[PDB]
Design a protein around this ligand. Sequence first.
Ligand code: RBF
Ligand code: UQ1
Ligand code: FES
Lengths: 32, 198, 412, 202, 250, 446
Amino acid sequence: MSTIIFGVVMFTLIILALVLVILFAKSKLVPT
Amino acid sequence: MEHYISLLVKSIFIENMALSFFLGMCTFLAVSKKVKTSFGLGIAVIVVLTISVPVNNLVYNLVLKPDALVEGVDLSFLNFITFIGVIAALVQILEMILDRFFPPLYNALGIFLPLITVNCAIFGGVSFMVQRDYSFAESVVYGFGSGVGWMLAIVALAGIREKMKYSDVPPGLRGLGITFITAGLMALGFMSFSGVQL
Amino acid sequence: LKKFLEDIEHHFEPGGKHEKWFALYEAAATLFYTPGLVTKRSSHVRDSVDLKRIMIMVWLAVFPAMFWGMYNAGGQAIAALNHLYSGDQLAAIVAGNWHYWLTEMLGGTMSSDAGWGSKMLLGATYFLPIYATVFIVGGFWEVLFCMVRKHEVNEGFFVTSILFALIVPPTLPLWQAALGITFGVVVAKEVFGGTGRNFLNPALAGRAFLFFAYPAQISGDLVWTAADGYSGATALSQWAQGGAGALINNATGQTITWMDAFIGNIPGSIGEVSTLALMIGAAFIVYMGIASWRIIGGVMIGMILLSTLFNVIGSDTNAMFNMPWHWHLVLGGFAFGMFFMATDPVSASFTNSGKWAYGILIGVMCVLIRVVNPAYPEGMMLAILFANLFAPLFDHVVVERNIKRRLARYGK
Amino acid sequence: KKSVLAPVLDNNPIALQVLGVCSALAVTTKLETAFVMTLAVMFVTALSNFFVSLIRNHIPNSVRIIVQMAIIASLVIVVDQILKAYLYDISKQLSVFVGLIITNCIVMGRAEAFAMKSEPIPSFIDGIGNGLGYGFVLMTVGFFRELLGSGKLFGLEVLPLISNGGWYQPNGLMLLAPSAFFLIGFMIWAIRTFKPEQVEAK
Amino acid sequence: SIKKTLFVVIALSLVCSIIVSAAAVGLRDKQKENAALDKQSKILQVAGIEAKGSKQIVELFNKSIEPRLVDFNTGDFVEGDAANYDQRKAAKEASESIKLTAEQDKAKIQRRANVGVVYLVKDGDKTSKVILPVHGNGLWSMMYAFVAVETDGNTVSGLTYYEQGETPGLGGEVENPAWRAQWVGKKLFDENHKPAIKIVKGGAPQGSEHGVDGLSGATLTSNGVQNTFDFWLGDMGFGPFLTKVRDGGL
Amino acid sequence: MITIKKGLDLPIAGTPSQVISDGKAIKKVALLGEEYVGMRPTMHVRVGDEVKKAQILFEDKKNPGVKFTSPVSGKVVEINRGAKRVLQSVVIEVAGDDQVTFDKFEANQLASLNRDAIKTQLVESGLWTAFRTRPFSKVPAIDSTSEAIFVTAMDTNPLAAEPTVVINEQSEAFVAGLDVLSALTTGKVYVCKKGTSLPRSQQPNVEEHVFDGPHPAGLAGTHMHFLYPVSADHVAWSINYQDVIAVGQLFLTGELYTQRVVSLAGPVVNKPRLVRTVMGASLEQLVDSEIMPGEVRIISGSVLSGTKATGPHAYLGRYHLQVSVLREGRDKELFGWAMPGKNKFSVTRSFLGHLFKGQVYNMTTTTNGSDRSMVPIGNYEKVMPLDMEPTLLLRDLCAGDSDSAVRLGALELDEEDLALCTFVCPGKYEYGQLLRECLDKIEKEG
Ligand SMILES: Cc1cc2nc3c(=O)[nH]c(=O)nc-3n(C[C@H](O)[C@H](O)[C@H](O)CO)c2cc1C
Ligand SMILES: COC1=C(OC)C(=O)C(CC=C(C)C)=C(C)C1=O
Ligand code: FES
């Protein structure tokens, strides 16, 4: 089940990376 | 460069992203009312499509392609979700650069970027590249040729629709109905080329 | 005649028993006699020109091409028939096709020594049924739309019908001609509101329908000569295969010289073969100011520049690279489209500067499709339809420059 | 019940909302691909609306699109895998357009406009209804294109082609892209003839 | 806010990923056999074997057809996993393919894999036919076909174009059964063993060993078919392989 | 000198003889209410009331302070109204010589007069209505000023009177009027004329510009396009030479000057000539015994841009200096559209008439065809000399797209500016009416 575990990890990491990039960008650009 | 010239022309005339494979039709038919509005939107599509297609070629070949990271592990079933994420990411990155470092450029293009966040043309262009198994060099030619054809089509439709202010379309076809007929007639003109016998 | 038209006028006016046929009545009454209407507001005098005369001059301008086309279609058919069959076999072929024995029944002959009368008569049997079918079927759609929208029948269908009939193979089936004209009139013209309100050439849109829907009957080596069982390529196809040396007329065994193509002694579409006949007709309408010489000048500029560029570049594989500009002029439908189809004022650009760009685009596209597109030997219909899409765009560029000048008070 | 049949003619996604056009033009060359695409869109739209409505009260507004597209894409991936396993021949004909269901404006349109502000069961019904209207256009356009371009319906010969000893010559343009635009445009003309309230003002 | 946002995203991603990964992996084996059965059915058809059910196709393909790798340069068999070899993918790799020159590239394919796969149709234990996969560029797209050759290495037993994109009325007639039936009994080579199969424009003579009728109104596609067999019967294709077959191979 | 190439001079028979002669005795005159753009009249007179010369008849609601005064002394006999009670005309029967007098100055001090003093005298005398603004061709507001006042000292209209003959008789008044205009304008005064010599004002801000070429070289719209382009923020005023003479007489004698010299001409006029008349003179009495028998149309102004003088409109217009008479062209011709046309005039070369360069035509009011859609064979570009795209501008007018028309230069145009476009239109469109509807819509939303 290496493919399943690799699929689960990569799917989560790809989304987490995308979310973190947007959150970091929003905090450093959008004025408050 | 007969192979590259044929690919560029075929993607523009016989396999146009708008009039042949019908990508971005919802945006193509609606925002084409005015030439100035369509011209700015077309450039935004060109920029994103010309960069996202080669980038996703690398991501697919480095990770998603079979035996890319670990031998015996195929992550190609993540193509759909990964392409959506990277397309959305690159769009947001472009908004960050243009709205912060090139305010004149953001005014011309950034106003349309939310419309093309999940547009079928950008996702469709990436999908066609992977299916046809293009190389990196062919992806760049396909990406540029696909984007130019989309802007060329929507701007041409916008000029036609402005000219149609003098038309006398029947009420049943007025608006959406006559636009479909107009776009179909534009498809006839674009079928002039299917390749280059250089 | 005049008294009869006046007497029946009240029947088609509102409240009469023939109100629904009012569209037909005005199409007939105004055809014979002028409306006799006076002006109502400023410019109490008017120019003598109207849409009827403009359309009738273009309709008459293609008569020399039409008559030569019937003569050439018969001449090509008769020559090929005597090349293939002879004696009893030729007699059986003549009896088996109604075109052939109708010509012989009306005093003509199918023999190799047939005069110009027999050749033109044989061409007439191929062209008149096509023209009659196109006129009746297209006219029905024109009248039906006008009756439904309660408008008078605008002019321009006479030009559309005759031009469509002259750009088809002589062997075209009648049912396809009815479908082709139906697509051109309804889809390209009538759903937009009729004459003057469309953007696409109606006759070429109808030909494009037949081009893609039924390519077997409008391309190849079996449709351009009206001789049963005869297969023969044309000059554009032959040049694409083997260049200038391949221009041989297999019906007679003689090479196709430049004068043969210029005069019109070649197979092809009915009304396209004679460049000299098209030039005579075009000269009359260009002089009258009906056709735009800016568009015609632009087409020549585009064709000459791109063809010369291909000759300079050269190619050891594609024989179309070495075709000169003057060979491009006399082959295919280039002359017909340039003189009578690129000059359609409604489909073309509305600015003088735009007309130059519009014409150049047609000339460039036509040569490009001929040379670098292997699927199609000709591209004039595709070039004009493609340029109809960008004709408004050329106008937009021109006016934006004009608006910028105005905003600067023209330099004050 | 009325909510199911409302998006068929009164609020058709393609004829009125201008949504889902991309697949309607491309896949309707055959009824088999048009029927499978109808089921796939109906399946994805109904389940995406159902799951989104379940978590509608917890989706952050900053990454709302990301959350919605995570559900929609996952369903489409499952549909793509199933099609390759049981309908490989039809799945090969659909080409990239199976993936393009993610970017179909109908799926995201109904999820945001309806599923975010409605109970899950009505959201499931709304997805089924919009799929029926979307499928109605696909099957109608696919019917004419296949019958006039091939003389076949679902691969069954209805009009005998001349090449097979028949009498009907297939129309080549029906298998080409311009025919799809024309059929939809005339289809809209017919719908708005019997539904005058949908006529756009001049 | 941030804690709630990450918890929802992570929980949603985990549930979606598990369903996606399970579906992709669980169905993977059935997906790859569907691709195989599609091509195996086509090879059975050109070989003249009747098979309708999916199980019938699998059992007949294993019993009657044995795929083998062939080196184009030498014409000798090569040991390898023939049932899983992908010639199209190998043709796009520089390490497993050679770039053709203008003189050699008769079929306009621009590349050729170093080793190809042939299918030996065996009736029991003795080879009866050999299936050669050939491809060449048509007017609109690349056309892929299977040609069945008798053990003499000269006689064609059948032809089948299984992937083409030509116009259905003009060029698509390569799939017409009447046109395919003409290839049965034709000779690929002359008495000098030169490639001699000819696509005759306007109709080949009724009594002809090498002539095949061209497609009506489709000269350009016929040239593509003629160029396809010219290249693949030459020294750059199955030339040396068919030379060894006629010498007493298989 | 500015030379005009694009344009058309109509060779219509019946050209006037450029000799001034006394006209018929005029017994009643009128002021036309529909010839003023955007004018909503408040009537100050009733039927039976006796009015003096230069006495106010009605006032404008939409343009406060502007007074329309009687040109003669007499009695109001009828106040004609049409659909929606629109003021057609107010007719005064001439009886007596009573008048209202104003201040008079010397020719030396005219250029030094205060602007407010000049405006007060012009408004009270009713001569303020001679000015028309550009855009919108309206009477200027009494509190507004213009940096450009254009004097139309030329006339290229068909059958038009030569301004040189009239100005030479009133040279002193013409120069005096120019001096008043020089003080009135905040910028310059543009006297637009041909190459013929005219009396000159000594003021440095009065400039003479020579325009040469065919019609519309003589129109004020053409002059503004080449000398002072107009827009929303650049408004210019125009006035004809005979009104400039009236301005000079007003400030020299203190009395309103209502004399006019109009050309009476056309195919059916027995003796075409210049006749002396009065403002608003009845055209039924002026044209009496001057016309050949048959059904004729009397036109106030030129054939290209004029008012059909029938019924309540049968009076000389405020801004019209000629009277054109034509036959009504009701004849039906068998295949007339297909005839060679030896005696048919056209801007195209589809008729044999253009082969005879010296031919004059007895043009009638016939339309020469039915109404159709526009087919741009390029006639508009041959007669439009301004730096505009005529075909695309006309399509906007037909389509009712006011916003696009403004961007294409509709604000620079008057109805007379599109008269040639209306003339040469194959589809028989009337672009003058379409332009006014677009201009009215623009003002309403402004
Ligand atoms: C010079 C000229 C050329 C024309 N050419 C064509 C033509 O090529 N095809 C056609 O259908 N109608 C033609 N017409 C007729 C008509 O203008 C055209 O159908 C418009 O598109 C009608 O709106 C022509 C008319 C003129 C005056
Ligand atoms: C040449 O001008 C034309 C006419 O008469 C002059 C027509 O009658 C008509 C009307 C024809 C029919 C069949 C109602 C057309 C369209 C036309 O172009
Ligand atoms: S379905 Fe809306 S853009 Fe594709």
